[PDB]
């Protein structure tokens, strides 16, 4: 809405920026201090700047919103030695194009949004055990034995009870059928019995691509044609399979495990038979349901045949497949031991299937230049478990990231702060920009502001919480990390998480950027220093901090002591860019006068712990 980053170039590049239409902050080695302060504050939009910055600390130059970018790796600072956000490659200098410049900054920009909710995602998983909202993403990193991961991803195009296909959406290339098989199945797997697994090549590339929940699964393999591997955690299988019975005989009962079965068996002029070895591969499972969390069989569709039976929670299609290829997987959720409660998913049964209709489904689906995007939806609805954030009621310590603040969620402000109360980490889009690759909506700064701050629960804009989780941190958030402090501004981040003792007025808690042309504006749009800053960082709407531990830190803390103020922060690790009790509640009291009802209790709550301090 206003948070701008400050696009800080080194040396050799400097003279293109100047033919901008952006402005270019310059410096020189003095500046002091509260000079950065002042003038990065005259900033409305991003900024190019450039010159020796060699004084200062990185959270320093995080706070203030600088992204590096140069033809050189990294660059010198205070605090340590930056690896540069956005290298250019020189050919790219150099040259000399001001925009093919521009676009390149643009595109790593967004690449660094990832690293923004990496960072934040990756607190999490060092902290929490619920996860809502999910997706892949958060999928990719769970341990499956110890995080639960939860939400309402969107569903790809099913058979079952059940028809409604498809409708079409657009799609992309993806790994080659039978791995990008293999890729989806597998998340909390521990011993995959997998027949007619062939030659191997298959399982073979998906160690070449997806090396840990590789080794992380133990596999029995069964097929004549197999050839030996070493590979300790392949178990390899030279026997044919008729008979659940050549599976019993490979299975540790005396020890639990999420086990699971995958069935790709093919033979050597109808195939009548091609079907039985689908029947058959399913009623393996089903005898043996009660050993696997579920199975993957293989399900080719007949053509003699115009509708007929088999075993299943559901069918779906299945990426990369040639387009000719009329073979659909079959999925079957199983009882069964378990880490992913796939209860959901109806308990595998006997399913009248409309060939012409599964027809249907891989004329649209199938295509071996199509499947990105299934594979993902595959791979969530299987393993994903579809519960609604806002309605969970949760006995265990919850995260909730970047899915508060959607559209669907629209009216239901009040369920979302509640979660706010309560989350270890969760997020909601402040961005009032006009907005794009996100479809979200924004709640209001300073509702955030006051809804938010608790006893137990830290309320900082994105970069404020980047900073804070490095500072307390620093091997959850190392330092050197790169993002966008701008995009990272966009965010409000709520973390279950004590005010520091002390209160010491670090980075992450007062950035405070433009504060002065900040409240110029609002007093020459709507009108009417503590106490006038406090007002204007709330009736601004640009700002997001911690109001309880910013209460905490001004009046528990500063004064305090020229002397016993700087000791503490030593000592707190802390750093800063800026060198009673009642004006902060004729503050408090102005602005709700100005806003009963877009607001606020609430107010209320905080005044009456002023004058009950
Ligand atoms: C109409 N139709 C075409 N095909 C494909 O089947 C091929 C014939 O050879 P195939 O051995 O039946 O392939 P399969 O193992 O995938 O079933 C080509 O005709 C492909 O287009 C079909 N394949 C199946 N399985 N079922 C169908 O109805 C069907
Ligand atoms: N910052 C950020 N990180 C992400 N990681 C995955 N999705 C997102 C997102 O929307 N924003
Ligand atoms: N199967 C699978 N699909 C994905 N789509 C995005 N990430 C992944 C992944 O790790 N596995």
Redo the contacts with the bound molecule.
């Keep these: 809405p206003e948070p701008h980053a400050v696009l800080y170039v080194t040396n050799e590049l400097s003279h293109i920026v100047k033919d901008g239409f952006l402005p270019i902050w310059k410096l020189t080695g003095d500046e002091s201090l509260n000079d950065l302060w002042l003038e990065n504050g005259k900033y409305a939009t991003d900024v190019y700047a450039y010159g020796d910055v060699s004084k200062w600390t990185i959270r320093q130059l995080r706070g203030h919103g600088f992204i590096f970018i140069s033809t050189h790796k990294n660059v010198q600072l205070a605090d340590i030695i930056k690896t540069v956000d956005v290298r250019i490659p020189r050919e790219v200098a150099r040259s000399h194009d001001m925009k093919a410049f521009e676009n390149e900054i643009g595109r790593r920009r967004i690449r660094m949004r990832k690293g923004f909710g990496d960072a934040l995602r990756n607190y999490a998983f060092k902290m929490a055990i619920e996860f809502h909202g999910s997706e892949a993403e958060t999928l990719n990193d769970a341990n499956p034995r110890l995080h639960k991961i939860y939400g309402m991803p969107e569903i790809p195009p099913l058979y079952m009870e059940y028809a409604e296909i498809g409708t079409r959406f657009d799609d992309e290339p993806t790994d080659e059928k039978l791995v990008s098989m293999l890729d989806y199945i597998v998340y909390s797997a521990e011993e995959v019995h997998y027949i007619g697994c062939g030659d191997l090549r298959t399982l073979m590339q998906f160690k070449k691509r997806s090396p840990g929940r590789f080794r992380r699964v133990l596999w029995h393999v069964y097929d004549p044609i197999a050839p030996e591997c070493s590979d300790p955690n392949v178990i390899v299988h030279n026997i044919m399979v008729d008979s659940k019975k050549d599976i019993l005989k490979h299975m540790n009962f005396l020890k639990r495990v999420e086990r699971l079965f995958i069935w790709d068996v093919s033979s050597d002029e109808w195939?009548t038979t091609?079907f039985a070895e689908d029947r058959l591969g399913e009623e393996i499972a089903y005898e043996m349901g009660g050993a696997f969390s579920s199975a993957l069989i293989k399900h080719?569709?007949?053509?003699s045949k115009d509708e007929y039976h088999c075993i299943s929670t559901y069918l779906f299609p299945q990426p990369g497949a040639d387009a000719?290829?009329?073979?659909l997987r079959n999925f079957m959720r199983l009882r069964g031991y378990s880490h992913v409660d796939r209860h959901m998913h109806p308990d595998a049964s006997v399913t009248k299937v409309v060939?012409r209709d599964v027809?249907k489904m891989v004329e649209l689906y199938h295509g071996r230049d199509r499947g990105r995007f299934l594979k993902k939806r595959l791979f969530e609805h299987l393993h994903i478990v579809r519960k609604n954030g806002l309605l969970h009621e949760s006995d265990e310590p919850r995260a909730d990231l970047f899915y508060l603040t959607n559209r669907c969620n629209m009216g239901l402000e009040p369920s979302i702060y509640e979660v706010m109360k309560k989350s270890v980490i969760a997020t909601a889009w402040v961005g009032r920009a006009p907005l794009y690759d996100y479809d979200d909506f924004a709640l209001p700064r300073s509702t955030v502001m006051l809804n938010g701050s608790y006893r137990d629960i830290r309320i900082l804009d994105g970069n404020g919480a980047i900073l804070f989780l490095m500072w307390r941190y620093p091997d959850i958030v190392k330092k050197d990390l790169t993002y966008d402090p701008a995009w990272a501004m966009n965010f409000a981040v709520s973390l279950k998480e004590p005010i520091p003792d002390p209160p010491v007025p670090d980075i992450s808690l007062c950035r405070f950027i433009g504060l002065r042309v900040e409240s110029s504006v609002l007093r020459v749009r709507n009108p009417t220093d503590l106490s006038g800053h406090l007002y204007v960082t709330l009736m601004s709407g640009a700002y997001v901090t911690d109001l309880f531990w910013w209460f905490k830190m001004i009046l528990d803390w500063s004064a305090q002591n020229r002397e016993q103020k700087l000791r503490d922060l030593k000592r707190s690790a802390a750093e800063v860019i800026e060198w009673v009790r009642n004006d902060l509640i004729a503050a408090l009291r102005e602005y709700k006068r100005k806003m009963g009802m877009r607001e606020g209790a609430s107010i209320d709550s905080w005044l009456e712990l002023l004058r009950h301090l």
Excluded: A, C, F, T
């Design positions: 195939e091609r080719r569709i007949p053509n000719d290829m009329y073979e060939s027809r």
